[PDB]
Each structure stands twice: as C-alpha cells, then as structure tokens.
Amino acid sequence: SNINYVILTVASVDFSYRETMARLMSSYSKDLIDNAGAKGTRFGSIGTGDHAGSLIFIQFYDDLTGYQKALEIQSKSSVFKEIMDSGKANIYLRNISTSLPTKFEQSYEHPKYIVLTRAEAAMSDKDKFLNCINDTASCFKDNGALTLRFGNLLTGSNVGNYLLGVGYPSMEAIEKTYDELLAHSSYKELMTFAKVNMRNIIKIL
Amino acid sequence: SNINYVILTVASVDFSYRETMARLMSSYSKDLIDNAGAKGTRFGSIGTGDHAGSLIFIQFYDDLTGYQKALEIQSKSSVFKEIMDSGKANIYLRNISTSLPTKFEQSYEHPKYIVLTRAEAAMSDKDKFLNCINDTASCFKDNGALTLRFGNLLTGSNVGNYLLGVGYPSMEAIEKTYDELLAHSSYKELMTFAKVNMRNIIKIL
Amino acid sequence: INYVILTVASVDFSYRETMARLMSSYSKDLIDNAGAKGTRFGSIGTGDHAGSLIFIQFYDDLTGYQKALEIQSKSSVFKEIMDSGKANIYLRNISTSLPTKFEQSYEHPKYIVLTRAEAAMSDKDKFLNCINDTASCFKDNGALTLRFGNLLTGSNVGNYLLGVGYPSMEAIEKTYDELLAHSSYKELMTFAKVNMRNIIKIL
Amino acid sequence: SNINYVILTVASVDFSYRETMARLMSSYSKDLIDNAGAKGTRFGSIGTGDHAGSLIFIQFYDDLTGYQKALEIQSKSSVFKEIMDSGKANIYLRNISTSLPTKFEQSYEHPKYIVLTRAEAAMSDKDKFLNCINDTASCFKDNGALTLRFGNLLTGSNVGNYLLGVGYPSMEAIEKTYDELLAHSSYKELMTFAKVNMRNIIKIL
Amino acid sequence: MSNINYVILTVASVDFSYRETMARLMSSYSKDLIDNAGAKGTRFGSIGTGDHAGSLIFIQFYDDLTGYQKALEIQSKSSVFKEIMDSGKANIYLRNISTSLPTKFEQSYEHPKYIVLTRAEAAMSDKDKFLNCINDTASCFKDNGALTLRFGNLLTGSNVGNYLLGVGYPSMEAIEKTYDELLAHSSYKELMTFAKVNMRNIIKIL
Ligand SMILES: [Cl-]
Ligand SMILES: [Cl-]
Ligand SMILES: [Cl-]
Ligand SMILES: [Cl-]
Ligand SMILES: [Cl-]
Ligand SMILES: [Cl-]
Q1: CB atoms B172 and C172 under 8 Å
Q2: Could you give the strand order of the β-sheet that contains E196-205, starting from the edge strand earlier in sequence?
Q3: Dihedrals φ, ψ of C91, to 5°?
Q4: Do D106 and D159 form a contact (C-beta atoms < 8 A)?
Q5: Which of A150, B62, C87, C119 has the lowest tally of Cβ within 10 angstroms?
Q6: Which ligand is nearest to the CA of B51?
Q7: C13 and chain B: CB distance < 8 Å anywhere?
Q8: B205 by DSSP, 3-state: which?
C-alpha cells in the first residue's frame, strides 16, 4: 500500500481540436482531482516516436479504488461526453503502471516536459533496477529534474516492462541530465541487465 | 457499482509444464477466492487463433479494490514465485474488462469451453449493443450456454472494444448456439453497427 | 504430391449471400474445366480473421491451377465479384498435399480445422510419422478428411499445414480429447510449434 | 561495376483499372528503355502471399545513374501523371536490389510468371550463397527456367536480405524446377545457413 | 532536376559497449566516403527517442546517385567496414534513400549536436503547398538557432512517398524555442490541414 498507480491514456486528435481539448481536459481534471481523489493529472502532446502528435493524459492514484471512482465520474461527465461525441478524438491505448517508492526529491513545480522511458528486464532484477534509479537520483535533481516516478506496466501488450517518468522545466534540463546520466557508472551497469525499448518526450499542454 | 471487472492474463508456457501449471494455478485460485475476494476464476488453453497454445487465466472481481488485494497476494505467494522462477511461463498480455448487467440466467456449472468474441463499435451505440445481447439471451441459454458476460476493454491496445465471454458445456452446445444466433434478427442488426475483430475458444484445464 | 490453393477475402456482411451465389457458379466451372479435384467455401470462425471468407481449391498438379487462372479471366461470375467492390482478397497461398495413411471420406464436411506449425524441414519424416500414428484418433472420433503438407508461398512459407474435415463440432471435441492425450502427439510437441489453429464453417 | 541494379515497386490498384494500367505501363516502359537506359522492365500482378492482388513493377539498370535518369523521365511523363491523377493506383512500397553475376544461361523469352524468393543470411556467407546458386543453375535451366537474377536488397525494412528472381514460361516449369531443386545437395546445404522468409509468384500482365 | 540531391539513411542496432568504438571507426569510414566517393558530408549519431531509441543512425549526402554507387564500391574494399560487420556487434536493419529538394533557408557550416527528423504523409499533388510552408517558416528555425534544414521525399522503403524533414540544432534549447514559435505560426497550422506527421525523433550526434 506504499505502492501507487498511474493511468496513461493516449488518443489521436484532429489538429484543429487540440487546443479545445486541452481546455476541456483541465475542467475534467479538476473534477477528478476534487471528486475521484486523483493526486494530480498531466495532459500533453507526445512529441516524438511513431505516436508523435497523439495526445496523452496521465492520472495519479494512491489506490485502484480511486480509479474506479474516476470511472464513475466519466459516465456522469458532460465535458467527457462532449469530447467523445465530437468525433475528433480517438482513444486507442490505455494502460496502468505501478508507481514505486524512490529516493528522489519531488518538486511541486508543474513541469513543461515529461520524458517517459520504457525498458525490458527480468522481474528478478527489480531491486537492482530500483538501486540504479536511486544511485542516479542526483543526476536528475542536480540538472533540473522536477519529478521522478518509476514502476512496471501492469496491463497491455508491454505488461511487465519497467517504466520511468521524469518531469523537467525545459529541454536544456533534459540535455544536461542526459549528458551526466550516460557517463555514470550505475547507468552503464543498468545497461547490462535492462534493454530500453522506448523513450519519448511529452510537451505539457 | 453495478459494474464488475474481469482481468484476463495470457502467457506462453512450455508444453511440458502445462500439467504442473494447472495444479499450481488451482492453488493460487483458492488463495484469490479466499483472501482477495475473487468471485471465481478460469484457467485454460487458448485453442484457436494466433495465440493457439498459450494459456489464459481469468479473474472476476466486483471491485478494483479486489484486484489490488490480489496484487498484494501475488507478492507474498510461494506458488506464484515458483511459476515465475521456473522460467517456463512468460506473461505477455494482461488487460482489464468491465462486466455489465445482462438479462441472462447464469449457471454455476463450471464450463468446459469459453468463447471470447471481441468487436469494434461506437461508444454511443453502447445501449443498442446491450439490447441486442439481451434480445439474443435465449439463443444462448436454450442451446446450452452456461454463462454470459459482456462489457468493454478498459486497458490495452484494444481499449474500448466490446468483449463477450460465454461458457459452454461442450462444443456441440457451441455449434447449436451459433446455428441459431446467426439466423436471429438482433444478431443481423448488431452486424450493421459492430465489427467482430476476433473470436476464439478456450479449453478449460 | 498434390496442391491446395487457399484464398481469403474480407466481405461485407450484406454481400454474404450474393457471394455464396457467385461462388457456386464458379466452383462448377473450375471442377468441370480446370480439372479441380474439389473446392470448399466457408467463413473463418476464429482468430483475428474471424468473419473473413475462405476458398480452398485442390489440384493434382500446378498446371491445373494455371488452367483455373485462365478460367478466371473469362468468368462473368468472377468479374461480378471483383466489380462489386464488396469482396477484398487479401491473402492467397499454395500448399503441398502429401500422401498420408488416412481413410478419406466423400462426405462433404460441415467444419474444417486448419492447424499450422513451425518445424525444421529435416523433421519432415518424423512429422509424417506422428500424423500417421494418430490417424485413428481422427477417424475414430468422426473426422472425414485429412490433408497435410507445407506452405510453398507467402510469409509463412515452409510452415507445415494440417487441414481436417469434420461433420460436427462434437467430432472436433472428441478428436482433440483423444489427440491431446496421445503419445505421438506429445512427441510432436517436442519438435513442432503450433503457431495457428482455426475453424472454418462450410457455407 | 559488374554489379547491376533492380528496382521493385508495389502498388495497390483498383481491379477495374488493371487493364488500362497495363496499357499505360508498357508506354511508360518504352520511355524508360529508350530515354533512361533501362535494360528491360517487367509488370505483373502478385498472385500469392499477403500482397495478393497488388501490381508490381520491376526495372533493370546497369548503374544507379540509370535510375536517376528514370526519375527525371517521371516528372516529365504524361502517362505517369495520368496514373497518379487517377486516384486508382497507390504505390506503397519501393526498394532497390543489387543484381550479381551468376553462371546461368539467360534467355530472351518474355516470361509468363516470375518467382521471387527472399532469404535471411550472414553477409559473410555471401560467397557460399552465390556458389549454391551456381551449382543449382542447371536445375532451373533444365526444367524450363528462362532468367535468373540474384542479389541483396539495398533498401527497405528487409535491407540485407538475399533476393532471387526467376522467370518461367508456365507453372509446370515451376513445379518441375522445384521437384528437382528441393532434392539437390546444394539446396539442402543452402538451408543450413539461409532462412527463406518469403516466396511468391508474379503473373506477367 | 539535377538541382535535387540525395540522402541515404541507415539504422543499425549496436551493442552498448561497442558504441564508442563504432563512432571512431565510422569517422574513418566517413573520411573515405568524403574523399573517394564524393560524399558531401556525413552524420553519425544515436536515435534518442521513439521505438528505435538506442539504435545508431548514419546519414550520407550525395549530389547524385552515382556518388552512392561509388560509395558502395568503397564498402567492398574497406577494412573499417569489414571489421564492423565481422564484429557481430552491429546489425543494419533499415536503409532508405530520400530526395533533398532546394529550400529557401540559410545553411550553416556548424556541425550540429542534435538532428530532428520529422516524417509526414501527404498527397504528391500537395508537394508545392508543402514546400511553400517550409519556406514560409524558414525564419522560425533560423531565428531560434537551427543550423541546417533539408526536406524531401522517401524514395524507398515501407514509407516510400512520405515527406521527410531533417533539421540540425546546436542544443535542445534551440529545439524548444523553434517549436514554441513554429506551433503558433499560420503556415504550420495550414500545413496541418493537408499533412499528417507520423513520426518525429531526435538524433544525438556522436
Ligand atoms: Cl533513460
Ligand atoms: Cl490446446
Ligand atoms: Cl459472436
Ligand atoms: Cl492440431
Ligand atoms: Cl527457393
Ligand atoms: Cl514538425
């Protein structure tokens, strides 16, 4: 119960409806934050990879009951109905991840960018993994990283993959983080037992 | 909260380990039924399609709270650790589905076969879909069907698809059901606004 | 050695009877003029192609198939299907059909189970052995026809393919009840990986 | 510069336009042979596999400058413009292959069918590969094969795969060629270090 | 017609340990192509984003396809190339060729630290509308620090016909500032009415 949960949803959206949608979604966020007990949300545009241009919504819950309450909010929500009736937004992926305890100094600052990284590794290496993450915590915080969350995808066609989400105020902070990170022993160790199979930048809208 | 939830897990398993697996799984099932509040499980091999020969595990919960307790049960389970440590079972897919109220007389008979059907349709046709399912209930029951569950995928690459699960005592009962169903007006009607994109048989082990 | 041609098309649900009509005109044509040793036409009941329609042709030689191709170009029935815009052929492959020790029936099946597997080409003989050692599993429990060979074309070229005709689904159940608990089957599982199994309903 | 090149283009084409397409394509071929220096072309429908019913165009050049002159002919060609403007043809794949010197007696006979075979193998086995092809050159010629070209895909998602193209006057010649080939020592040896991942028949239109 | 140039893009998966060795081998191989094949430059880097994150990418620029043919003849004779292939540590799994069309953009000679590749689907009949938009936004890029810009269509591969844009940058800050301006520019919003971006990725020059 020290474990938390993250819902990640991805939709293709007509380009014209993008700004409309971000405004509707902040309304929909306040509703989840106030009534479903959501511990924050993020909404942004995926900037990189094959889903570039898709929009992503991220929800944080302490327990899966929270998400279940969020599902009851959807059914009753006018803003949600409007987006689905528009015919301009198509949800094509939704998956849930655990969020595990890390030794990382969380900041309250809303990030402008998020880097999600996904990797394949044995479930038996879960602790090795967690140690590397904690050993490089200062690579991130020192170079401007705001938030760090880490866990495993519980659902979908990448079930079991480890996932890392890191919030930044700028792309400079990303560059400076990755300069240090790639020349750090714990990172080079990670690369002996974990295969990164995805890395992408989201722009918070 | 009239809604229930189904978790579906699929894994590739060495043919030799199949028997041992089933035996370990029924122990793990007892665990979930008694301690996680699981309202039943199914374990079988996928008989058809591209995943022919993979094994599938199905869990039913009234709430997502239930599934969270089940996750806590995993971390502590020796039976579960053994399966994972064997290197003979690889989980490559897990998704969650809703289960909606349907006008169908459920039997408690353990099914010998399950048929999963998955379809694409607008979320705005949700009620037309459910009405058709209810108008055809007698096709199923009359020809031997044991159980009928229905809802949408909450997670995964097919998020949003409608999903139908039906339990059967025999393949004859499947033949007789489909003989009637294909020639039923409500079915013909469903096929004007829903496209089946997958159908498969599971053999309960 | 014989040959089997398998063609798969996605068809609109509303076009399904027109399709069944135009295909019956077409089979007679191939049987009588191409030297086709039979055809089957059905809907794929399972898998990710559930709802597609499948057409199966049997030839003793590929020269038979070449004649069939020359019958297509002149066929009105074929022209109508393609001009309909309601049928989209998306797969066509050719398979060998090897001699097996199985007693064939003339009874038109109601269902066909297709099973496809990956195995070394050096295991060809062991494979055929297993298939002949479990011939009785099928015939005992009602199987009508059995064909076995390798895909000569397409993305699964080289895979072994097994086609079995049945009068009912009860017969499939009883067959697989016996088959899965047979020694030769468990041995086949040591060197062959089934990567696909599907039921066709003969229309 | 003993190496030649082969461009292969694949398009989906409305069935009704097929005959017109063919007529326009032999015009466009004349233009390439006469002005681009193309050393022959072939146009046909793909009879098997997942691209059954697509049309394919094959161009032969001694040098890539040839193909660059071809590109210059396109921009000027009315025939080509018309095909594009029709909305009836959609080029969805084009790749380039080397064509390596083989000890095979080439015929000038217009083929009726072509069989393309594609295989995966080490680049360090290039010579063992070519020697097999040369040892079996009689299997093809003796049984009716007209032309044989062999090389590696330079471009595409199958870059590096070996590609064989063999022309035939009829299906019987294909069947007789494979009856002999499959039971030849050099062929059996090729299969110890090469994996065929595709084989398909093209009907010359 | 001969105002068109050509770009070869090759992508390989490489063991992490071999990546530094590889970059050093590759600069030798580049000299060879620049001096003997007539290559008008090369770029070598790691793909930082997308499903190919961690793969290495090699980019070659030629005025003519004859240039690339000479390059192919250089490979067969190159010891550096043989070593890489014999290592068993590098696997080329994609190579495609793109046109490079004339654009109204002030090219810099500064070696970039990052490249952004963008790929889009659009009718071939919109080719000129496309080029106009690219030229109308040229200042967005140059103003905010972009070094080079190349634009054209994939000639080969499973995305044959897609438009492809490659832009060089000195830093990630320059990318951020470029995209801040670009996304709020009329010509960009117009481009998005007839072109669908289906891929965008950052390469780090090694
Ligand atoms: Cl990372
Ligand atoms: Cl099974
Ligand atoms: Cl159904
Ligand atoms: Cl089977
Ligand atoms: Cl072959
Ligand atoms: Cl862009």
Answers
A1: no
A2: E90-100, E5-14, E56-62, E42-47, E196-205, E114-121, E163-169, E148-153
A3: -155, 135
A4: no
A5: B62
A6: 2
A7: yes
A8: coil
Please list every residue in chain A whose beta carbon sits closer than 8 Å to the beta carbon of residue B91: 159-160
Q: Which chains touch E (3 or more CB pairs under 8 A)?
A: A, D
Beta bridge partners of B67: none
For the CA atoms of E87, E91, E97, E98, the dihedral, rounded to the nearest 10 degrees, stands at: -110
Determine, for residues C92 and D201 on separate chains, whether the beta-carbon distance falls below 8 Å: no
Answer whether A touches E (≥3 Cβ pairs < 8 Å).
Answer: yes
CA distances from D146 to A70, C105, C161, D202 (A): 68, 42, 31, 14
- Dig out the tokens for E68 from the structure: 């690339």
What are chain A's domains? 1-99 (3.30.70.100), 100-205 (3.30.70.100)
Q: Position A143: which residue type?
A: N
- CB contact, 8 Å: B196 with chain C? yes
Strand ranges for chain D from DSSP E: 4-13, 41-46, 55-61, 89-99, 113-120, 147-152, 162-168, 195-204
Burial A42-60 (b: 16+ CB within 10 A, else e): bbbbbbbbbbbbbbbbbbb
Q: Give start and end residues of each alpha helix (H) in B124-202.
A: 126-135, 137-142, 171-182, 185-190
Work out whether the CA dihedral E65, E67, E72, E73 comes out positive or negative. Answer: positive
E158 CA to centre of ligand 6 in angstroms: 20
> E118 CA distance to ligand 6 centroid (A)?
5
Question: Is C120 in CB contact (< 8 Å) with chain D?
Answer: no
Q: For B121, what's the count of Cα atoms within 13 Å in the CB-facing half-sphere?
A: 22
E–B touching, 3+ CB–CB pairs within 8 Å: no
Residue B145 neighbours by CB under 8 Å, 6+ apart: B166, B167, B168, B173, B177
Closest CA to C114 of C183, C37, C201, C188: C201
| B53:C170 CB<8 A | no
Q: Under a CB-based contact definition with an 8 Å cutoff, are residues A151 and A6 in contact?
A: yes
How was this structure determined? It was done by X-ray
Residue E138, CA atoms < 13 Å, CB-side half-sphere: 15
In DSSP terms, which residues pair with D164 in a beta bridge?
D117, D150
Resolution (in Å) of the shown entry? 2.5
